[PDB]
Subunit: 223 residues, 2 copies
Amino acid sequence: DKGRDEARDAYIQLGLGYLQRGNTEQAKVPLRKALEIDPSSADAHAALAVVFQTEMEPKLADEEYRKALASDSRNARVLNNYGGFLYEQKRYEEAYQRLLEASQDTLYPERSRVFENLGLVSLQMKKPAQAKEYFEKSLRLNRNQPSVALEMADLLYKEREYVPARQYYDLFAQGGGQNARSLLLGIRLAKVFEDRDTAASYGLQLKRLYPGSLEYQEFQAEK
Amino acid sequence: DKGRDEARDAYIQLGLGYLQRGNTEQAKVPLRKALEIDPSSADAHAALAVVFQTEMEPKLADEEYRKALASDSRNARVLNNYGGFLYEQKRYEEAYQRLLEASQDTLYPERSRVFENLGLVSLQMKKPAQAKEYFEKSLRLNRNQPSVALEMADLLYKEREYVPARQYYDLFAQGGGQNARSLLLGIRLAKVFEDRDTAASYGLQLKRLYPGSLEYQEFQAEK
């Protein structure tokens, strides 16, 4: 430490600040300074990686993520962000392992999010049964996550388990957020439980956006 | 069933019986009969794998571990055993991946052993802090693990955190079982404290006896 930690952490925040803005170029200055104080600064490298990840420089980003991991091997936040990065580069098998390593930290406040990601990566790898188990782990840690509930509902609707699916969809409805997809599910669900009211009520399809989406089309045909 | 799955599980038990009894080669016959009944039996392949691994036919053991995992790649018990094999074969990176997956079965009765292996593998990958985390989780699932307490004591001793180290060492001592390595630690640990009694009491190093061990040499050069 030697007070250096404070100085380093400050340069990092300053760097993150510029990042949260979009001035990826200016952020580098403070981050590089933090790095001069602590060459093995996990956060410094991690921050620096998000920058390169932003400037569309996957190669440098990946390099910086590895550098961060080479210090705080038990840094769930970085592991999780790297997993998100790996997910974009479509390197699923690797994302899965990083996220799976991130979930080991039982104290990480966002551990429930880590399980969500693991579920999302399992879907892309064509492993529904595995994804469902992870989405469940996520709700097991915090039932109040509408996005995770939406994924549970969709997975259940496809197995034709309409009752538990509706239950999870309602858990997702209490969030107010809705997209073309979640709306088509709600309609299809309300249609199963003979709820012609709520079904039509989701007129948010035609208007309220998504007027020319596939979901809106399916709605028309199945209507 | 056709009573076929009945005889299959019986043959596995017989095989595991010979295996546990020390008649390794003998285990093959029963396990082979089980494979003829169900050429895709994960348990049969798993057990046969252990036979080869015991006979130090690593290549053969690997093929059976893989075949076992082809059935269900989420088999915590086989995933752990394979992981231990990989550790023994110095294949740390693959070991870690396998064990990480095995850790996801929170219902696995021997889940503590998985975390114990993750600690061991972490040490070989030069990641002490991360290893410490896994050993803690292991002890939390099972306090009755002198060998894991030992690893903690050593890891802690090297970080110069003597108090918690001696605390883990005493738990290890309650396991009634010492060796050259543990004797040398218990001594260096009793010296840090005002216990020149137990330090000498560990004369077992000299007689009874590793009189020709490295530990014993370092012991005299540190009296």
